[PDB]
A paper describes a structure:
The structure was subsequently solved at 2.75 Å resolution from a SAD dataset acquired at the Canadian Light Source Synchrotron. A single SAM domain tandem was observed in the asymmetric unit. Despite having ~60 % sequence identity to CASKIN1 SAM tandem, we observed a different oligomeric architecture in the crystal structure of the CASKIN2 SAM tandem. In contrast, the CASKIN2 SAM tandem presented here forms a domain swapped dimer where SAM1 interacts with SAM2 of a second molecule and vice versa. While the SAM-SAM head-to-tail interaction is predominantly hydrophobic, ionic contacts serve an important role at the intramolecular SAM-SAM interface of the dimer and the intermolecular SAM-SAM interface between dimers. Near the linker, an ionic contact (E565/R618) from the SAM domains across the dimer interface further add to the compactness of the assembly. In the crystal structure, the C-terminal segment of helix 5 in SAM2 extends to G658 and makes contacts with a similar segment in another dimer.
CASKIN2 and its mammalian homolog CASKIN1, are multidomain proteins that share the same overall organization. Sterile Alpha Motif (SAM) domains are well represented in the human genome reflecting the versatility of this compact, five-helix fold to facilitate protein-ligand interactions that include other proteins, nucleic acids and lipids. Using the CASKIN2 scaffolding protein as a focus of this investigation, we have demonstrated that its SAM domain tandem is able to sample monomeric, dimeric, and oligomeric states.
Residue numbers in the entry:
A (entry chain A), B (entry chain A): 21 to 160
């Protein structure tokens, strides 16, 4: 198991790791767990109040989000972080590409005065744009 | 370096790994490399014809795509693979959620006769739907 070893690690930091299989059988992984509620834990069989209280508390301390597991960037900076290019955010913003909907229409010739000059970052970004467009038209 | 060790590994499988820094300085990573052309390799300074011929050939043999690095799913199955839920594709298709644009309007009550019954897979999917909607309205 691959996310099992992520759960088992996190549950071990407070000696509740014998609940690992509870999250597995329910299909959960760590980022989804971070958004459960107490009733969700009850639903998957965490019924002992002493343990459900403690797992809830330990979940609020989980501060790793937000486009995991979905992998849908909602805003521009999230997306440049999916890609490995957050260093370009504020160049894109100074040039008026400050939203997903506007970035989708960015074009190969703007790139030089925005400041994306390494050709690999150039290509990676424009492939992201191209197929971001392909996803908008996907709604009809 | 993290994708450097991915390049250095792949270039080593044909003893050309001393080109690793060429791809780094240009910002490339493996999935972007897989889409380069010969002129792209020239541009980043792979100028010796014997090596550029061989790296090109070795790139066509790279068959790992397609939403990496972009992390924008273009079609429904890609997206259920971003998430860890491809086992549900054909249930979603038998129920008429066979595109991104239609999935974006899937709702919590359909889930039982589609066949998504593990609550963690339920939550993971509906978070993906919710924020997929949030991304469509993002285009105005």
């Amino acid at each position: 198991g691959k996310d099992a070893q992520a759960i088992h690690n996190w549950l071990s930091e407070f000696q509740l790791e014998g609940y690992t299989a509870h999250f597995l059988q329910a299909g959960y992984d760590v980022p989804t767990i971070s958004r459960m509620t107490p009733e969700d834990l009850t639903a998957i069989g965490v019924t002992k109040p002493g343990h459900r209280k403690k797992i809830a508390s330990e979940i609020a301390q989980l501060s790793i989000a937000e486009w995991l597991p979905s992998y849908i960037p909602t805003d521009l900076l999230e997306w440049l972080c999916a890609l490995g290019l957050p260093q370009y955010h504020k160049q894109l913003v100074s040039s008026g590409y400050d939203s997903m909907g506007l970035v989708a229409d960015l074009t190969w010739e703007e790139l030089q005065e925005i400041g994306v000059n390494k050709l690999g970052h150039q290509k990676k970004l424009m492939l992201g744009v191209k197929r971001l467009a392909e996803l908008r038209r996907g709604l009809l």
